[PDB]
């Protein structure tokens, strides 16, 4: 009954949105696998604040597993005995060990590369064929094919920019064997350098049939998400003013198998 | 007996009879006013029928409707309330998971151009028969969306919504049959691949030659005939139309549109068929 | 297993057969999609020591010609070969599904973009000849597959069938690797299979081979309409020391004609979880 505000990072609104969803997910007592553990701070968060029973994970970069280990031992010293990462270079979960560990997990979590992520920030062309790569989420769909096969009973909890709308995000789960549920969302502001052509091209794109398409992306003018904008609209306000403040939603969605 | 003004629905119903729904639990996606619910209950002798529609005002009407249509069996009709897109609600999924068979005539490119007008007139006919004098808008609606089904592989032949329902059925009812109605202009091979690609063995249960209204646009199907493949290599493809009500003289989409570029009332036919998908 | 057994006339089939031997089919019950004239059946019974080989073909005449070829080439094993009859597209008959569902391993060298340009004329001449004795896959229904974007749509269509009909069976497939192994592996990972590359060779491509489809791959913009980095894998030498894009390969030949262009063929096994 006391929100752990001190815990969520004050720096990155994407990671903050993720961590708040992880807290809501209810990871207490579960085995959890994180795709792309990075520096390990999410693992530390899930161990210390969420109270996961066990956490494993992997990264594409082999040096990151070892560095994640220090961090977890520094930041969650009295819970670090429960962090068992998988070394070494692991794209998605594509090694036998990563597969074994995913196979034993109750929840798979991640914030994966996706069109629309922040610039500041996997191999990439082999995911181009995925149907949901048409909205920039191929890599995310690639993981859902793997999780459904290796751990068919586990939840999958993923972080998304929601410029394409929640009907599409929910579709990515429904198309792949999972009932989706939005755990948490937030309005976030994007850098002034962010490119969004991709998003204007989306609403200007003919279907695929192809016939029609009066669809519109989701942006906001205020940090409260009061004033909706299309991608074209938004793209305008920046042609008007290069330092115009543009907002979109980031949200955490859990897919639960049947 | 069947209404011959709506051949897609005749086709649908005739297909359902053949399905073998005697004593089974069935879910219908898009129950409408319950015409198909009552049919299965009265003619097919189903033990239980449930289902939903994306218009939330419809279940109530249907219920009523089925009561009047099959009162001696309307107690086995158990609709699910709410604005149910496909089977997207816990309660909807729950019922689907308990069903032996899932049936639908779903939106799809090539459905009759007047399908949304017929539904509006059927909704308002059913409310008048229930003793209510209403506002017309009570029977209109903004359903079904389309953008989230656009990325589906089989949306390229206009069946994205149908594919999406198959992703759903397979996961929440992996042993259930799925019985679906389609316009076959794209070819029965393509219709069969829709099922095969999604874990189902297809069987064509019944089919019929029907005529398309004169003002029906078929440039979509023409556009498929001139398209290249995903490869960018030449694609060989032909749509299936007919010049005769019997389905004896075949026409591609390009030919069919020629006969209405020269004349303007040339009778143009195509197939409508019921396909059952059965999992292994 | 002796060198003489592997096909000395055809690098694609030689690659397939070296890969099947490495798959360890001994004692297994196997199913081949596209048996053709049955030589691979003979190779799997006689060299791989399979307990039982079934399979089918789209051309309904080939199962009968494959029986005679297996009777004449592995007479001591011929009783272990039980082809499925009739025209069979992939495995799409109740008898082919029933056999596939009893199989330990499903194998195939399936039609695919990048196959040798003369394979369809071979199969045609090969029919006719073998047809005495005495007396193709369309590609339109498979065009929707995501992996058709790389020309592997028929292969993906099989993976959807095997997974449903024989969920515990391995699946062993021969591929040209011009689109790279990450893509080939992703075809399996996307469809419920863990890929392992069993064997691979560097083959020479016929002289007038059209590689325009692969050039186009290197210049396409993805599904998102933005940039994409991608090079097909070709080689200038028969050991693959010197790499080449499809564009480099095409250019090497625009200025020659008889330039030697090489690429990889490789056998991948897809194992369920």
Numbering used by the authors:
A (entry chain B): 11 to 131, 160 to 296
B (entry chain A): 17 to 296
C (entry chain C): 13 to 147, 159 to 296
Show passages lifted from the paper.
MmtN is an S-adenosyl-methionine (SAM)-dependent methyltransferase family enzyme. MmtN catalyzes the S-methylation of Met, in which the methyl group of SAM is transferred to the Met molecule to generate SMM. Recently, diverse marine Actinobacteria, α- and γ-proteobacteria were shown to initiate DMSP synthesis via the methionine (Met) S-methyltransferase enzyme (MmtN), generating S-methyl-Met (SMM). We propose that MmtN uses the proximity and desolvation mechanism for Met S-methylation with two adjacent MmtN monomers comprising the Met binding site.
The best diffraction data was generated using a MmtN K141A/K143A/K146A triple variant from which the crystal structure was solved to 2.5 Å resolution by the single-wavelength anomalous dispersion (SAD) method using a selenomethionine derivative (Se-derivative). Importantly, this MmtN triple variant retained SAM-dependent Met S-methyltransferase activity, exhibiting no substantial difference to the wild-type MmtN enzyme (the specific activities of MmtN and its triple variant were 51.2 ± 1.3 U mmol–1 and 47.3 ± 4.5 U mmol–1, respectively). MmtN crystals belong to a P212121 space group, with three molecules arranged as a trimer in the asymmetric unit. Each MmtN monomer, which is composed of six β-strands and eleven α-helices, consists of a cap domain and a Rossmann-like domain42,43. The MmtN trimer is assembled through interfaces between adjacent monomers, and contains an ion at its center. Ion chromatography measurements implied that the ion in MmtN was a phosphate ion (PO43-), consistent with the result of PO43- detection analysis using the PiColorLock reagent kit (Expedeon, UK). A PO43- is located and likely bound, through electrostatic interactions, to a positively charged ion-binding pocket comprising residues Pro169 and Arg183 in region V of the MmtN monomers. Pro169 and Arg183 are strictly conserved in MmtN, but not in other deposited SAM-dependent methyltransferase structures, suggesting that this ion-binding pocket is unique to MmtN. Therefore, the ion-binding pocket is essential to stabilize the trimer MmtN structure. In the MmtN trimer structure, loop, helixα7, helixα9, and helixα10 of one monomer generate an unclosed hole, and loop of an adjacent MmtN monomer pops out from the Rossmann-like domain to insert into the unclosed hole, resembling a gate latch and bolt pattern.
